[PDB]
C-alpha cells in the first residue's frame, strides 16, 4: 500500500541544523511531485516547499527561503529537507505530501504521518475560514465556508481550491480537489460548491468520523496558502 | 446427396431473401434527398498536431469526455493525449509491440490494446500507485486481434483474424460469448449507441449484425467487392457505413435490410482504412490509402470536402462524442485534430 | 553589363538552390536527421556567399575598382573568408561523419547525437572565425599602418609569405588531403565483404572530390604564387579564381543534394 | 498564461517526451529480423541455433549486437493482412529445406514442396512492402539433400536441369533458382548460406549480412547511395 | 459437412423470416434524423472561435 514515513525530528538548539527524511513505499515515487507542509501545534497547516517530479522545478515559501533545501533521491525513494539556521517559529510537525499533476489527476492525495521538530528557546492569496468552531450532532447536514481574496477560477474553467480533513491525532486527508471533484475513498455525502471567491463544503448526514479540522487550500499560484481551519466537534 | 439438397435449399433461401429485399425497395435514397440543399464545401483546418509517436500509428479512440484520446503505435507504446493542450497524459509501454487496435473505456478508467500476440490487454489508468498497470490479459483468440470496443468496465467485445468475434467478461478473463459465421478475417467492429447490437465487417466482403445478449447473427449484408476494412454506425443506430478495399463506402440500413447508398468517385481507387460519422450523421468521413481523408454528404453522396495533411496512409480516424473535432492518425507517426 | 546579368543569374541560382535545400529539410519531416544538419549549415553558408559575397564582387568587377570604402572592405573580406572556410570545414566534417558511419556502422551511430553534431558545427565555425577574422580585421593595426591601396580591396598579409603559406595549408591543403584519404577509405570500406553499390558510390566520391578540387584549387595556387611575385597575376585571372570559389557554393546542392533521391523529388 | 497545475502537467509531458526519445533511440539501435519459411523446413533448428500462439519473439545478442527475431508461423490468416507491420525490419531470414526437392505436399496432391517454397519466396521478395529489405537465405538439411541426391535426381523437380547428380552442382542450381526470383536486383541483396552445423557459423553469417545491410543503410543515409 | 450445411440453412431461414420496412421509409427516417440534429453538429456549421476549444 501507499506509505510515507518521516524521520529526523527531535529537539534542536536554535540556529542549528537538521535534515528530515521521508521514505516512500508502495507507489511510483519518481512520477510524483512532493511537498513539505508544516503544522505548528496551536496553529494550522502551512506550506513549506515543493520539488517537482524529475527535480526540474523547486519552490519554497518566503519564510523558509534561503534557509531550507528540498531534494529527492529517486532510486532510494527518499525525500530530504535540509533545514539550516532554525528559529523558534520552525517548531512544527512536518508532513511529506505526494501530488501528481496531469489532466484529471488528484494532487495532495496522500500525506505522511509527520515528524515533530522542536526548537528550544505581500501578493499571497489569503484564505479566510471565518467560523473557527461549529457545534454539531450526528445525522445533521452542515456547511463549512471558505473565502478567497483573489478569484480562484482560472481561464481554463478550473477552480483551484482543495478541501482537507484532519482528524484528531492523524494526518490530513484529501476530501475535495479542484472545488467540486470528490476524492478516492471519500464518501459521497461530502460536496463542494463554489462560485469564484466563495466556497462551501456540505456534509449531509454527519457521522462520528467527520469531526476534526477542515482546511481549504488554494492551488492557483505559488506559494500555496491554507485557511485557518474550521473545527467540528460533537454535542 | 444430402449435402447437395441442402445446397439447393440454401440457394432457394438466398433467392427468397433477394426477392424480399427487392420487394421493399420502391425508391432509392438519392430520389428522396434530391430536393434537400447540399451541405456546401467543408473546409477543416489542422488545429492541433500530436507529435511523439516514433513509428506508424495503427489505431486511435476518443474518450467520452472528448478531451482525452488514446493512440497506439508499433513502437510498443499507447500514448494518452490531451487534445486541447497537446500534453501527454500517459505513456504505456506494451509487452508486444505489434498492436493493431486500441480502445478507451466509456468511464475513462481503462484502456485496451491488442494485435499479433492474439491477446487483448486491459490497462488500469486509475491506480493508487500512480502508474498504469496491466489489469488483464484476455487470451483465447487463435488469430490476430483486429478491433476491440468496451461495453462497460467489465465487458469488452473483440474481433479477430480467426473469423470469430468474442464477448469477454473482464474480471474473470473468460469468453462469455463467441460470435461465429464470418468466413474471412473480421477486420473491424462497431457498437450501437444502446450497446444491444454490434456490426462486424470481414474479409469475406460481408458485414454481420450480432445481438450481444443472445449471441446470434441477426442480419447479413453484402454488396462490397472486397475486404471490408472499416465499419461504423449512424448516430440513430438504424444504419451503418462500411469502408472497403474496392474504393467505395456503402451505407446499409438495418430496418430495410439492404444497401442504401454507395460513396465512390472515379478519381479515387485507393481502399478505405477508416470510417466515421459526424454527430448529426450528415457527414461521412473516410480515410484512404492516397494519404488523404474524404468528407461525403451522407444523404447525397457528393464529396463535401478533403482533409489533406498526412504524408502517409491515414490508418485511423475518429469523431468526438460532441462532434467538435475529428482526429486522424496515420502511418507518418502523427495525429491531427481537425475542426 | 552582360557580365553583371550572368553573375546575377548565377547568384540567383545559388540562393534559390540553398533555399530549396533548407525547405527540403524543414518542410519534410522525414529529412530531419543528424546527417542533414551539416547539409543545413553548409547551405546556410552558401546562402551567405550567394546573397552577399557574390554581389559585392560583381559590382567590384563591373566598376573595376572598389569605391565602397576601407572599413566595409575589411568587413567583406572577413565575412567572405570566414564563411568560405566554414564551408570547407563543413565539408571536412561531412567527410569525417561519413567515414565513421561506414567504417564503424554498429558503434558510431549509437554515440552520435544532435549534441555532437552541434558541437562539431560550432567548433568548425569558431575555428574558421578565429583563423581568418582577427588577422584580417587587425593586420593593419598590428603593423600600425594600412599598406593596401584605397582603390583595391584585398588582404594585406597575402604579400607576407609565412602567414600566406600557413593560412593556405591550414584552410585548404590539409582539409583536402584529409578529405581525399577519408573518402578513398570510404570507397574501399563500401565494398561488400560478405558490384553496383561500390561503383556507384565510387562515382559519387570522384564527382564531389573533383568538384572540390577544380573549384577551390586555382585560387590557392594563385595565392601561393602571388606572395613571391606581386606583378605576375593580372586581375582577370584573380576574378576567374574568385568566381570558381563562388561556383563551388553554387553547385554544392548539385553534387550533394541530388545524389540523395529524396531531395531530388522534394525539388 | 498557464496555472500551476497546467505548468506541472506540461513538465510531466516533457518528461514523457524525453523518456519516449530515449526508448526510441534504444529501439533504433537494435536489429529486427523477420523469420519466414515453409512448415517443417528447418525453422525450428534455426531458432535453436540462434537462441543459444501469437508471434514468437527471440532475443539474442552476438558480438555486442542485439537481435530480435520474429516468427509469425502461427498466423493462419492471409499474409497481406499483417505483413505491412514488418515493413521496417532489417532483414528477412528465409529458411528453405533442400530435402523437400522430391517430396510432394501432403495437403495438396501433385504439388511439390520446392515449387511451393519458390512461390512463397517470389511472393515475399517481390512484395511491395519489402522493396529495399534484404533477404538472408538459409538452405537447411544439406546432408539429407546429399544423401537423397545420390538416389533421386534433381530432374524430378527441375526438368530443365542440365547438370549432374552430384551434391555441389545441384546445390548451386537450387541457389541460382532461388536468387533469380529477385526482380529488384538493384534495391535489395540476397545472402545465401547452407546452414552448416559446425562452430556456430550461422550466427556469424547472420552478423556479417546484417553488418552489410547496416553499411548499405548508412550509405543511403549519408547520401552516397 | 451436413452439420455446417444444415446450420447455414437454419441461419438463412432465421434471416429470411425477419420483417422488413420499405427503403423509402428508412430513407425518410435518416433524412429526418439528419435535419433534426443539423444545428447541433459543429462540423456541418462552424461554431464561433470563442466557442471552439481547439481554435481558442
Ligand atoms: C596586387 O595584389 C592583388 N591584387 C588583387 S586585384 C584582385 C581582384 O579581385 N581584382 C579584380 C576584381 C577587380 C585581387 N583579389 C587581388 C589580390 C588578392 C592581390 Cl594580393
Ligand atoms: C574568399 N574566397 C571564397 C574567394 C576564397 C576563400 C577563402 C577562405 O577559406 C579557405 N581559404 O582558402 C581555401 C578555403
Amino acid at each position: 500500500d501507499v506509505q510515507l514515513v518521516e524521520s529526523g525530528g527531535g529537539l534542536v538548539q536554535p540556529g542549528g541544523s537538521r535534515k528530515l527524511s521521508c521514505s516512500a513505499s508502495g507507489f511510483a515515487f519518481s512520477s510524483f511531485g512532493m511537498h513539505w507542509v508544516r503544522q505548528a501545534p496551536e496553529k494550522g497547516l502551512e506550506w513549506v516547499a515543493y520539488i517537482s517530479s524529475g527535480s526540474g522545478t523547486i519552490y519554497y515559501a518566503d519564510t523558509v527561503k534561503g534557509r531550507f533545501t528540498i531534494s529527492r533521491d529517486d532510486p532510494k525513494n527518499t525525500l530530504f529537507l535540509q533545514m539550516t539556521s532554525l528559529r523558534s517559529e520552525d517548531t512544527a510537525m512536518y508532513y511529506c505530501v505526494r501530488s501528481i499533476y496531469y489532466y484529471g489527476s488528484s494532487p495532495f492525495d496522500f500525506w505522511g504521518q509527520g515528524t515533530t521538530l522542536t526548537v528550544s528557546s505581500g501578493s499571497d492569496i489569503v484564505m479566510t475560514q471565518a467560523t473557527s468552531s461549529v457545534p454539531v450532532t450526528p445525522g445533521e447536514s452542515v456547511s463549512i465556508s471558505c473565502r478567497s481574496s483573489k478569484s480562484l477560477l482560472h481561464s481554463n474553467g478550473n477552480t483551484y481550491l482543495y478541501w482537507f480533513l484532519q482528524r484528531p491525532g492523524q494526518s490530513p486527508q484529501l476530501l475535495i480537489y479542484r472545488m467540486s471533484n470528490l476524492a478516492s475513498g471519500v464518501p459521497d455525502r461530502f460536496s463542494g460548491s463554489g462560485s469564484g471567491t466563495a466556497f462551501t463544503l456540505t456534509i449531509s448526514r454527519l457521522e462520528a468520523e467527520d469531526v476534526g479540522v477542515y482546511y481549504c487550500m488554494q492551488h492557483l499560484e505559488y506559494p500555496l496558502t491554507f485557511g485557518a481551519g474550521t473545527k467540528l466537534e460533537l454535542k | 446427396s444430402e449435402l447437395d439438397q441442402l445446397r439447393q435449399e440454401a440457394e432457394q433461401l438466398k433467392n427468397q431473401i433477394r426477392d424480399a429485399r427487392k420487394a421493399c425497395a420502391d425508391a432509392t435514397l438519392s430520389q428522396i434527398t434530391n430536393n434537400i440543399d447540399p451541405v456546401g464545401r467543408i473546409q477543416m483546418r489542422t488545429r492541433r498536431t500530436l507529435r511523439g509517436h516514433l513509428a506508424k500509428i495503427y489505431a486511435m479512440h476518443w474518450g467520452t469526455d472528448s478531451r482525452l484520446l488514446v493512440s497506439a503505435s508499433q513502437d510498443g507504446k499507447l500514448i494518452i493525449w490531451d487534445s486541447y493542450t497537446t500534453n501527454k497524459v500517459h505513456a504505456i509501454p506494451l509487452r508486444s509491440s505489434w498492436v493493431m487496435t486500441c480502445a478507451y473505456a466509456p468511464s475513462g478508467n481503462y484502456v485496451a490494446c491488442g494485435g499479433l500476440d492474439n491477446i487483448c490487454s486491459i490497462y488500469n489508468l486509475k491506480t493508487r500507485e500512480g502508474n498504469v498497470r496491466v489489469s488483464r490479459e484476455l487470451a483465447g483468440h487463435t488469430g490476430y486481434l483486429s478491433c476491440c470496443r468496451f461495453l462497460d468496465d467489465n465487458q469488452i467485445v473483440t474481433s479477430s483474424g480467426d473469423t470469430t468475434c468474442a464477448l469477454w467478461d473482464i474480471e474473470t478473463g473468460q469468453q462469455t460469448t463467441t460470435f461465429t459465421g464470418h468466413t474471412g478475417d473480421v477486420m473491424s467492429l462497431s457498437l450501437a449507441p444502446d450497446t444491444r447490437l454490434f456490426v462486424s465487417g470481414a474479409c469475406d466482403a460481408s458485414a454481420k449484425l450480432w445481438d450481444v445478449r443472445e449471441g446470434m447473427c441477426r442480419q447479413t449484408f453484402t454488396g462490397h467487392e472486397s475486404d471490408i476494412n472499416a465499419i461504423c454506425f449512424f448516430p440513430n443506430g438504424n444504419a451503418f457505413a462500411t469502408g472497403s478495399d474496392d474504393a467505395t463506402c456503402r451505407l446499409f440500413d438495418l430496418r430495410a435490410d439492404q444497401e442504401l447508398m454507395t460513396y465512390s468517385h472515379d478519381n479515387i481507387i485507393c481502399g478505405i482504412t477508416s470510417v466515421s460519422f459526424s454527430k448529426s450523421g450528415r457527414l461521412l468521413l473516410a480515410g484512404y490509402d492516397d494519404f488523404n481523408c474524404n468528407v461525403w454528404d451522407a444523404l447525397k453522396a457528393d464529396r463535401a470536402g478533403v482533409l489533406a495533411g498526412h504524408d502517409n496512409r491515414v490508418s485511423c480516424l475518429g469523431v468526438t462524442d460532441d462532434g467538435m473535432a475529428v482526429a486522424t492518425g496515420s502511418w507518418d507517426s502523427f495525429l491531427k485534430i481537425w475542426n | 553589363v552582360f557580365i553583371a546579368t550572368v553573375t546575377g543569374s548565377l547568384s540567383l541560382v545559388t540562393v534559390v538552390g540553398n533555399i530549396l535545400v533548407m525547405l527540403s529539410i524543414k518542410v519534410n519531416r522525414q529529412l530531419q536527421t543528424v546527417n542533414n544538419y551539416f547539409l543545413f549549415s553548409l547551405a546556410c553558408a552558401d546562402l551567405i556567399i550567394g546573397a552577399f559575397s557574390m554581389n559585392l564582387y560583381t559590382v567590384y568587377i563591373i566598376k573595376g575598382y572598389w569605391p565602397l570604402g576601407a572599413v566595409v572592405c575589411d568587413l567583406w573580406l572577413a565575412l567572405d573568408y570566414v564563411v568560405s572556410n566554414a564551408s570547407v570545414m563543413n565539408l571536412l566534417i561531412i567527410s569525417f561523419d561519413r567515414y565513421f558511419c561506414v567504417t564503424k556502422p554498429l558503434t558510431y551511430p549509437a554515440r552520435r547525437t544532435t549534441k555532437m553534431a552541434g558541437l562539431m558545427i560550432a567548433a568548425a565555425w569558431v575555428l574558421s572565425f578565429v583563423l581568418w577574422a582577427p588577422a584580417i580585421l587587425f593586420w593593419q593595426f598590428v603593423v600600425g599602418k594600412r599598406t593596401v591601396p584605397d582603390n583595391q580591396c584585398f588582404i594585406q598579409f597575402l604579400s607576407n609569405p609565412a602567414v600566406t603559406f600557413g593560412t593556405a595549408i591550414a584552410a585548404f591543403y590539409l582539409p583536402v588531403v584529409i578529405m581525399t584519404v577519408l573518402y578513398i577509405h570510404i570507397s574501399l570500406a563500401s565494398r561488400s565483404r560478405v558490384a553496383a553499390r561500390e561503383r556507384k558510390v565510387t562515382r559519387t566520391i570522384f564527382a564531389i572530390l573533383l568538384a572540390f578540387i577544380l573549384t577551390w584549387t586555382p585560387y590557392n595556387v594563385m595565392v601561393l604564387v602571388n606572395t613571391f611575385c606581386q606583378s605576375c597575376i593580372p586581375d582577370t585571372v584573380w576574378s576567374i579564381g574568385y568566381w570558381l570559389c563562388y561556383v563551388n557554393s553554387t553547385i554544392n546542392p548539385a553534387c550533394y543534394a541530388l545524389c540523395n533521391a529524396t531531395f531530388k523529388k522534394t525539388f | 498564461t498557464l496555472s500551476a497545475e497546467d505548468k506541472a502537467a506540461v513538465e510531466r509531458s516533457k518528461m514523457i517526451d524525453r523518456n519516449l526519445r530515449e526508448d526510441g533511440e534504444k529501439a533504433a539501435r537494435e536489429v529486427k529480423l523477420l523469420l519466414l519459411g515453409a512448415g517443417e523446413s528447418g525453422k525450428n533448428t534455426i531458432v535453436k541455433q540462434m537462441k543459444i500462439t501469437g508471434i514468437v519473439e527471440t532475443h539474442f545478442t552476438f558480438k555486442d549486437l542485439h537481435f530480435k527475431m520474429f516468427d509469425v508461423g502461427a498466423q493462419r490468416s492471409e499474409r497481406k493482412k499483417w505483413i505491412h507491420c514488418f515493413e521496417g525490419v532489417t532483414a528477412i531470414i528465409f529458411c528453405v529445406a533442400l530435402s523437400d526437392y522430391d517430396l510432394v505436399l501432403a495437403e495438396d496432391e501433385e504439388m511439390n514442396r520446392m515449387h511451393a517454397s519458390m512461390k512463397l519466396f517470389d511472393s515475399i521478395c517481390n512484395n511491395k512492402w519489402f522493396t529495399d529489405t534484404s533477404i538472408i537465405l538459409f538452405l537447411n538439411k544439406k546432408d539429407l539433400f546429399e544423401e537423397k541426391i545420390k538416389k533421386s535426381p534433381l530432374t524430378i523437380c527441375y526438368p530443365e536441369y542440365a547438370g549432374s547428380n552430384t551434391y555441389e552442382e545441384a546445390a548451386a542450381y537450387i541457389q541460382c533458382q532461388f536468387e533469380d526470383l529477385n526482380k529488384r536486383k538493384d534495391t535489395k541483396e540476397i545472402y545465401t548460406h547452407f546452414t552448416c552445423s559446425t562452430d556456430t557459423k550461422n550466427v556469424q553469417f547472420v552478423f556479417d549480412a546484417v553488418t552489410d545491410v547496416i553499411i548499405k543503410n548508412n550509405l543511403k543515409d549519408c547520401g552516397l547511395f | 459437412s451436413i452439420a455446417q450445411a444444415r446450420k447455414l440453412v437454419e441461419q438463412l431461414k432465421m434471416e429470411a423470416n425477419i420483417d422488413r420496412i420499405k427503403v423509402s421509409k428508412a430513407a425518410a427516417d435518416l433524412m429526418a434524423y439528419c435535419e433534426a440534429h443539423a444545428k447541433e453538429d459543429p462540423l456541418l456549421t462552424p461554431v464561433p472561435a470563442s466557442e471552439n476549444p481547439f481554435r481558442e
Side-chain angles (χ1 to χ4, degrees), chain A residues 1-41 43-139 141-204 206-234, chain B residues 1 3-6 8-195 197-339, chain C residues 1 3-11 13-28 31-192 195-264 266-267, chain D residues 1-39 41-106 111-145 148-149 152-159 161-168 170-198 200-225, chain E residues 1-54:
Chain A
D1 51 340
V2 178
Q3 186 173 355
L4 297 162
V5 178
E6 294 99 338
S7 56
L11 189 145
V12 178
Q13 296 299 139
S17 291
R18 183 54 60 88
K19 184 189 185 69
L20 304 177
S21 288
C22 166
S23 302
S25 74
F27 67 101
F29 174 77
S30 64
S31 295
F32 282 77
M34 312 281 304
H35 302 249
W36 282 100
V37 170
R38 76 162 65 167
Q39 185 190 23
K43 315 306 176 300
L45 312 168
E46 177 205 322
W47 176 80
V48 171
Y50 161 69
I51 181 159
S52 87
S53 171
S55 312
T57 299
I58 295 182
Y59 295 131
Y60 299 99
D62 281 348
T63 299
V64 309
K65 183 78 170 188
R67 299 189 297 144
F68 284 17
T69 297
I70 192 176
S71 46
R72 57 191 309 165
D73 184 65
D74 289 346
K76 294 183 176 70
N77 288 14
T78 304
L79 179 78
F80 305 108
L81 187 67
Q82 173 67 72
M83 324 179 284
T84 304
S85 65
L86 290 185
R87 295 193 291 265
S88 295
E89 63 180 14
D90 291 359
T91 297
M93 182 176 282
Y94 284 73
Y95 306 96
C96 50
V97 191
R98 64 168 209 174
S99 69
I100 191 157
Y101 301 97
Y102 48 87
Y103 175 76
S105 79
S106 64
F108 279 73
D109 50 320
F110 194 74
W111 291 53
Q113 294 299 320
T115 176
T116 313
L117 175 60
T118 303
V119 176
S120 60
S121 185
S123 57
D124 301 353
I125 309 180
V126 176
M127 323 290 309
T128 308
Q129 273 169 275
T131 183
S132 298
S133 176
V134 166
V136 68
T137 174
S141 296
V142 71
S143 295
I144 303 300
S145 71
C146 184
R147 184 179 65 254
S148 177
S149 69
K150 186 178 184 293
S151 178
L152 288 186
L153 164 72
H154 203 255
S155 72
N156 50 27
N158 283 326
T159 296
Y160 298 98
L161 187 143
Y162 286 66
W163 282 102
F164 303 93
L165 162 64
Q166 183 170 49
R167 285 179 196 86
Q170 293 178 336
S171 58
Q173 194 210 348
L174 174 69
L175 292 184
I176 294 289
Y177 62 99
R178 288 186 311 264
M179 195 191 62
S180 52
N181 309 305
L182 187 144
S184 178
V186 169
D188 49 351
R189 60 185 184 264
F190 294 92
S191 176
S193 59
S195 60
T197 55
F199 309 94
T200 310
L201 174 76
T202 315
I203 298 169
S204 64
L206 186 148
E207 314 210 346
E209 62 185 342
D210 295 12
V211 296
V213 186
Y214 290 80
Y215 295 96
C216 54
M217 186 195 85
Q218 60 97 8
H219 207 308
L220 178 64
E221 293 177 350
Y222 283 96
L224 316 174
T225 51
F226 289 83
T230 298
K231 183 178 179 180
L232 295 187
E233 199 172 355
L234 295 175
Chain B
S1 64
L3 174 62
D4 181 65
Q5 185 173 355
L6 294 175
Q8 305 302 319
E9 190 176 358
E11 286 299 320
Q12 179 61 227
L13 284 159
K14 293 168 188 302
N15 289 337
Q16 172 191 356
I17 296 177
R18 173 187 49 91
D19 293 343
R21 285 174 184 184
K22 288 186 173 70
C24 56
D26 48 1
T28 77
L29 177 54
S30 289
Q31 282 165 30
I32 287 173
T33 69
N34 213 31
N35 287 330
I36 66 166
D37 291 350
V39 307
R41 184 178 178 180
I42 309 290
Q43 312 83 352
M44 301 175 63
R45 307 165 51 188
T46 307
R47 310 298 183 181
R48 311 277 195 265
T49 297
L50 308 175
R51 316 174 182 266
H53 277 310
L54 296 163
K56 303 167 157 186
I57 295 167
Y58 273 70
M60 65 89 36
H61 197 224
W62 275 107
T64 44
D65 66 324
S66 301
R67 185 171 175 172
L68 287 180
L69 64 118
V70 56
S71 55
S73 48
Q74 285 223 325
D75 53 2
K77 276 157 181 58
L78 288 173
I79 301 180
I80 298 187
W81 314 75
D82 180 359
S83 46
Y84 299 0
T85 65
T86 68
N87 282 350
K88 297 192 176 52
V89 185
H90 286 111
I92 311 162
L94 307 181
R95 285 170 182 162
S96 168
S97 64
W98 313 105
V99 57
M100 290 178 180
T101 181
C102 69
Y104 205 81
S107 69
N109 304 323
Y110 301 94
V111 287
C113 78
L116 286 177
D117 55 343
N118 311 329
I119 294 170
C120 194
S121 310
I122 316 288
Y123 297 85
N124 196 356
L125 304 178
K126 315 295 170 57
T127 79
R128 195 62 149 89
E129 297 72 64
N131 46 10
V132 174
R133 278 191 280 102
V134 182
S135 58
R136 281 291 169 260
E137 290 181 353
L138 316 161
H141 276 312
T142 70
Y144 66 96
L145 193 143
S146 66
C147 202
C148 52
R149 283 294 174 265
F150 278 96
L151 268 73
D152 57 85
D153 277 8
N154 203 34
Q155 292 177 334
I156 187 164
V157 162
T158 58
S159 71
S160 172
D162 58 2
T163 81
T164 68
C165 291
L167 163 71
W168 308 76
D169 187 3
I170 292 174
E171 90 189 8
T172 59
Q174 294 313 115
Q175 274 189 14
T176 301
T177 302
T178 299
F179 306 96
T180 58
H182 270 315
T183 67
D185 312 344
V186 193
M187 295 301 293
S188 51
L189 63 83
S190 194
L191 295 174
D194 46 15
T195 71
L197 300 172
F198 81 97
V199 293
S200 67
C203 281
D204 58 1
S206 85
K208 286 176 177 294
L209 171 80
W210 309 91
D211 198 296
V212 178
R213 294 178 179 84
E214 294 177 350
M216 39 182 286
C217 177
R218 295 291 180 85
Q219 296 155 234
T220 315
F221 302 90
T222 52
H224 275 303
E225 295 177 350
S226 178
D227 312 345
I228 305 185
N229 305 320
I231 205 164
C232 194
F233 274 116
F234 191 88
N236 66 359
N238 296 346
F240 65 98
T242 47
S244 186
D245 265 333
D246 60 351
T248 81
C249 292
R250 290 177 198 269
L251 177 78
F252 298 89
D253 186 77
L254 309 181
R255 277 169 315 141
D257 203 37
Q258 54 193 126
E259 188 181 336
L260 287 200
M261 184 65 77
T262 314
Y263 309 94
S264 55
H265 205 273
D266 289 345
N267 296 132
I268 61 172
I269 61 171
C270 300
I272 295 95
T273 69
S274 46
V275 289
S276 197
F277 274 106
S278 87
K279 177 185 198 43
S280 61
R282 184 57 185 268
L283 304 180
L284 167 68
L285 285 81
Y288 285 77
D289 300 329
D290 61 14
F291 304 171
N292 288 5
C293 181
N294 293 312
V295 186
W296 299 82
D297 198 347
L299 297 184
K300 293 180 87 64
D302 308 342
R303 201 190 304 183
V306 172
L307 273 63
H310 286 292
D311 290 345
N312 210 327
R313 175 181 296 184
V314 175
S315 57
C316 56
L317 63 84
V319 181
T320 61
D321 266 6
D322 52 5
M324 198 61 58
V326 181
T328 67
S330 162
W331 280 7
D332 69 336
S333 79
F334 298 120
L335 297 103
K336 287 187 166 61
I337 307 294
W338 307 72
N339 208 324
Chain C
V1 286
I3 317 177
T5 62
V6 184
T7 55
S9 83
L10 289 172
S11 169
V13 172
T14 312
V15 295
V16 301
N18 300 139
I19 290 174
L20 279 180
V21 171
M22 295 191 302
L23 284 181
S24 293
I25 301 175
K26 299 301 290 187
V27 174
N28 188 340
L31 288 154
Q32 321 184 11
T33 61
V34 188
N35 306 293
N36 279 292
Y37 295 151
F38 307 107
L39 289 181
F40 200 72
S41 164
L42 172 77
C44 293
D46 294 341
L47 180 64
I48 293 187
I49 296 303
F52 312 94
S53 299
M54 292 191 183
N55 302 350
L56 268 61
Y57 205 71
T58 63
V59 64
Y60 191 24
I61 62 179
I62 293 291
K63 294 197 174 182
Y65 61 89
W66 187 273
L68 283 86
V71 179
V72 54
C73 164
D74 290 345
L75 295 174
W76 172 60
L77 289 169
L79 182 63
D80 195 10
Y81 278 70
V82 165
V83 177
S84 298
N85 208 54
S87 178
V88 179
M89 288 322 176
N90 287 318
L91 294 186
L92 177 63
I93 61 174
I94 278 180
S95 178
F96 265 106
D97 172 47
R98 289 175 173 178
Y99 176 76
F100 289 133
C101 281
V102 185
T103 52
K104 317 166 182 179
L106 311 174
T107 59
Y108 176 73
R111 70 171 65 198
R112 166 165 62 100
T113 60
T114 301
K115 183 179 68 65
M116 294 300 293
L119 188 145
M120 294 301 293
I121 285 171
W125 284 88
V126 173
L127 176 63
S128 64
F129 194 86
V130 297
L131 177 63
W132 291 102
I136 299 176
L137 298 174
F138 305 128
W139 199 256
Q140 50 178 10
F141 300 105
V142 171
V143 294
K145 57 179 179 302
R146 188 184 182 91
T147 58
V148 173
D150 177 24
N151 211 26
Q152 281 77 26
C153 177
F154 58 89
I155 295 170
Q156 193 165 329
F157 57 82
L158 280 190
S159 177
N160 195 293
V163 176
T164 297
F165 274 71
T167 49
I169 285 299
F172 168 77
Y173 291 108
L174 183 54
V176 73
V177 300
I178 292 309
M179 282 186 55
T180 312
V181 167
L182 288 192
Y183 278 123
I184 276 167
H185 282 213
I186 283 171
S187 69
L188 303 173
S190 77
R191 180 193 299 106
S192 179
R197 174 208 298 180
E198 187 189 3
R199 292 181 294 103
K200 180 167 184 305
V201 303
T202 314
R203 287 192 173 94
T204 296
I205 292 309
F206 181 78
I208 60 171
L209 274 189
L210 178 64
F212 187 83
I213 284 281
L214 295 192
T215 57
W216 284 99
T217 308
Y219 168 72
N220 287 256
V221 69
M222 290 186 286
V223 162
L224 295 177
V225 65
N226 201 19
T227 188
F228 291 90
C229 160
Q230 295 295 100
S231 310
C232 294
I233 316 185
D235 64 332
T236 58
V237 198
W238 265 122
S239 55
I240 296 179
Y242 263 78
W243 272 107
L244 290 164
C245 310
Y246 288 150
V247 298
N248 189 225
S249 298
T250 299
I251 66 182
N252 266 342
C255 57
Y256 279 99
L258 294 175
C259 294
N260 188 21
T262 307
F263 285 162
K264 186 200 306 186
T266 314
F267 265 29
Chain D
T1 196
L2 306 175
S3 59
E5 302 199 18
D6 291 5
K7 281 169 187 170
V10 168
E11 198 197 343
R12 165 180 176 89
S13 181
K14 292 179 179 179
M15 282 204 44
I16 288 176
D17 288 346
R18 291 195 297 273
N19 286 316
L20 285 170
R21 184 180 65 254
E22 296 156 359
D23 289 345
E25 288 164 355
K26 78 190 57 174
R29 296 176 303 107
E30 289 167 350
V31 175
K32 294 184 175 70
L33 311 162
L34 176 63
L35 175 62
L36 294 174
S41 75
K43 306 181 56 179
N44 289 337
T45 69
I46 287 295
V47 173
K48 297 181 302 182
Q49 290 164 0
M50 300 312 162
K51 182 63 181 181
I52 310 176
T53 190
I55 177 170
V56 177
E57 188 273 331
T58 308
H59 274 123
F60 62 103
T61 304
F62 184 65
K63 285 190 173 301
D64 298 352
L65 194 54
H66 188 74
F67 299 87
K68 293 180 178 179
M69 184 179 290
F70 314 110
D71 190 9
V72 287
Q75 290 294 328
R76 300 288 182 268
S77 50
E78 185 68 15
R79 264 193 323 276
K80 64 177 173 61
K81 284 295 123 180
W82 48 265
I83 204 74
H84 50 79
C85 297
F86 300 96
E87 183 177 2
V89 296
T90 300
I92 292 161
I93 294 186
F94 203 98
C95 295
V96 166
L98 291 172
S99 61
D100 293 357
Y101 78 108
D102 57 335
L103 304 178
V104 70
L105 272 169
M111 174 49 181
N112 199 41
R113 293 171 85 175
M114 180 60 70
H115 284 94
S117 294
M118 291 186 284
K119 186 200 305 186
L120 178 52
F121 188 86
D122 180 48
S123 173
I124 298 301
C125 183
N126 305 307
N127 206 290
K128 64 172 175 290
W129 304 114
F130 303 121
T131 60
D132 57 339
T133 314
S134 294
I135 297 187
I136 301 162
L137 176 74
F138 277 113
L139 306 180
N140 306 323
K141 306 180 180 61
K142 82 192 194 183
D143 47 355
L144 192 50
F145 173 68
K148 291 180 181 297
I149 211 64
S152 171
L154 199 67
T155 57
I156 189 167
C157 183
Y158 297 94
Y161 186 39
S164 60
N165 275 346
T166 197
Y167 164 69
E168 59 274 350
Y173 195 63
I174 301 187
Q175 180 181 3
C176 183
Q177 292 296 100
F178 273 101
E179 293 178 350
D180 62 8
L181 294 174
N182 186 8
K183 289 180 176 56
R184 298 75 179 274
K185 295 291 186 179
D186 55 331
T187 58
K188 77 167 72 193
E189 185 68 15
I190 289 176
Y191 311 93
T192 301
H193 190 64
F194 280 88
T195 315
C196 56
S197 63
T198 179
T200 316
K201 291 179 60 180
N202 315 334
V203 180
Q204 182 67 38
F205 181 80
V206 171
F207 184 75
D208 292 350
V210 168
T211 314
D212 200 67
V213 165
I214 289 305
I215 280 170
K216 190 195 52 59
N217 282 350
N218 288 350
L219 281 171
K220 258 148 59 187
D221 288 345
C222 294
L224 294 174
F225 188 75
Chain E
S1 297
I2 58 172
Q4 186 174 355
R6 183 177 181 170
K7 185 199 305 186
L8 188 144
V9 165
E10 193 274 332
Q11 185 63 59
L12 294 175
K13 282 172 178 301
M14 179 177 72
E15 290 178 350
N17 58 34
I18 63 170
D19 293 344
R20 302 172 170 84
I21 72 162
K22 300 184 73 68
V23 165
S24 78
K25 182 176 174 65
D29 289 346
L30 293 176
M31 189 187 45
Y33 187 87
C34 280
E35 65 184 342
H37 295 74
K39 292 183 293 297
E40 294 177 351
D41 195 22
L43 306 175
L44 264 184
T45 59
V47 298
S50 57
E51 291 192 8
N52 189 341
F54 303 93

